Amino acid sequence: HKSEVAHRFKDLGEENFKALVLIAFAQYLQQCPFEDHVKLVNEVTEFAKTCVADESAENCDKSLHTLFGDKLCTVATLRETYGEMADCCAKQEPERNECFLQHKDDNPNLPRLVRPEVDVMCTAFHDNEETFLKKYLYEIARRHPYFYAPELLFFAKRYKAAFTECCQAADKAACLLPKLDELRDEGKASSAKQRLKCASLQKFGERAFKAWAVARLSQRFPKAEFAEVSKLVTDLTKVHTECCHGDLLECADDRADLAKYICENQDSISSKLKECCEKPLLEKSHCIAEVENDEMPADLPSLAADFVESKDVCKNYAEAKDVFLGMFLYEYARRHPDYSVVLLLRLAKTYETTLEKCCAAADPHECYAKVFDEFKPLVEEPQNLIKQNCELFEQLGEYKFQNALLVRYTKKVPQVSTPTLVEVSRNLGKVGSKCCKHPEAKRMPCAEDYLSVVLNQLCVLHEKTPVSDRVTKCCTESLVNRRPCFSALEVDETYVPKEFNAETFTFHADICTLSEKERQIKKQTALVELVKHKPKATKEQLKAVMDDFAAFVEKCCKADDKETCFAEEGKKLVAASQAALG
Ligand SMILES: CCCCCCCCCCCCCC(=O)O
């Protein structure tokens, strides 16, 4: 148009426009007070309304990157507060904006946000709901500057819907609390994934990312033709690159665009994209991204026909090595919405490797007619791991299950910090509960979704505090082997047991008055320490000690002289145990 601002205003809306400006300035000027941003937002919104009235109004012709940078350079305490960043204001536009993205601190040292009391929250939500949510929106935003604004705005409304529904119920706490935990864990998962995708695109590069996107895209759109999938996979990769770079506008438009292309060419991609294409500008992308698979043609020929038999495979392969392989992926992927993307990539690689060691022999045709037989083992390893673990998750509850992992992993890498083995083994227990609830078909894709963030979160720690050469060998290894590596770790025999520290096994009557979360963490923490002390204890020996302890807790948090029962009955447990574990 004549005006970028007036244009954004009209199709975004006054409400969303204001929330986004706020979030935007918060991701850039992370040290200025809330009251300071609320003034800029008003300043900018009063301006946008000026252009909607007259596109010709002075400055309305400026580009959003220019108007934005211009306002940023209006902060007088910029040089003092941010210093080096104020230097950016001396460069003109192409450079300036590039300079800001640069001096943007990813994880700034601000205090951990504490969750106030449900009643104080609900009350703040009553007197002034907008400033209540705008303040926390501001707090979240400044702490996660690379978080996609529109997505942040999406969470905001789910938060308002919980305070609207829960602050009205008699049992507020029983209402509000489980949602805030859900929302919190969902936004944290959503954030790690984004930081995780940008990390891959960096380490391994385009090829690997494209391969990945092909299998995922063709899994969702099993009907779309390889031409469309190729198209999208290419446009997609262009998007992640720009969004990763952290430029909000260049990333928002790129997503809007591809969403439009996908909606216009809808009938050529998926049948389950209806609703998403009927939603507004600021939701189309997020909708489609979280969309469901389409029913596969099921009029599908087969794969051993075009990739194992048909001589002229090496012919079609040498002509264009990747498109052929991409054709394998697209073909194999769309026929298996139940395989994890990495499993699919694990197969395409196997195929690639075989094609390279057979198209260079006398009779190729009879060299690669055993490949599909080689897919068998690669497929069953993760399949068998699922049942096995989902079966055990039923035999015991979530809590009893996490204890099994605790004992299992502490034995693999005992060198790892106890508070780390506990958290890690806790999240895993959750991945098992969130996924084992699903039927066979949707299991593998689920586990991969979760395991991927957990396994990375766990690696980033070894990134700062290396402990084992092993855990470090899988963390560095390619993402397609970054999981089968951990499944392969064996009990450490080199490890030399720790020495008794009664304090680690001294439980004062505190536990009796602690929430489930605390009773467990306390018990689990000793469990790890127990295995670290006696790493050769059978699953039997160990079950015993855990038994004589389950009872103990009762006998002393259900009896009239708490504290004496912990000192007297305690010495009997340690004594007995010390000798049971011999
Ligand atoms: C040296 C041996 C001292 C004995 C230490 C006992 C530690 C066992 C903690 C296991 C907690 C199991 C959880 C539960 O029973 O609910």
Curated annotation (Swiss-Prot):
Gene Ontology annotations of biological process type: cellular response to calcium ion starvation; cellular response to starvation; negative regulation of mitochondrial depolarization
Q: What would changing H126R do, according to UniProt? A: In Komagome-2
State the organism of origin. Answer: Homo sapiens (Human)
Which residues does the record list as N6-methyllysine (modified residue)? K532
Identify the residues that bind Zn(2+).
Answer: H65, H245, D247
Residues binding Ca(2+) 2 are: D11, D253, D257
Q: Quote the annotated effect of K534E.
A: In Castel di Sangro
The gene designation is ALB
Please state the protein's primary subcellular location.
secreted
Location(s) in or outside the cell: Secreted
Q: Which residues carry this modification: Phosphothreonine?
A: T81, T418, T420
How does the record describe its quaternary structure? Interacts with FCGRT; this interaction regulates ALB homeostasis. Interacts with TASOR. In plasma, occurs in a covalently-linked complex with chromophore-bound alpha-1-microglobulin with molar ratio 1:2 and 1:1; this interaction does not prevent fatty acid binding to ALB.
Occurrences of domain Albumin (ranges): 1-184, 185-377, 378-575
Instruction: Tell me what this protein is called.
Output: Albumin
Which keywords does the record carry? Calcium, Cleavage on pair of basic residues, Copper, Disease variant, Disulfide bond, Glycation, Glycoprotein, Lipid-binding, Metal-binding, Methylation, Phosphoprotein, Repeat, Secreted, Signal, Zinc
> At which residues is Phosphoserine found?
S3, S56, S63, S271, S417, S487
Binding of (4Z,15Z)-bilirubin IXalpha: at which residues? K238
| Tissue expression notes | Plasma.
- A GO term from the CC aspect: extracellular region
> Which residues are glycosylated according to the annotation?
10, 49, 135, 160, 197, 223, 231, 274, 279, 311, 315-316, 321, 349, 376, 411, 437, 442, 492, 523, 532, 534, 543, 571
> Could you confirm whether the keyword DNA repair appears in this record?
no
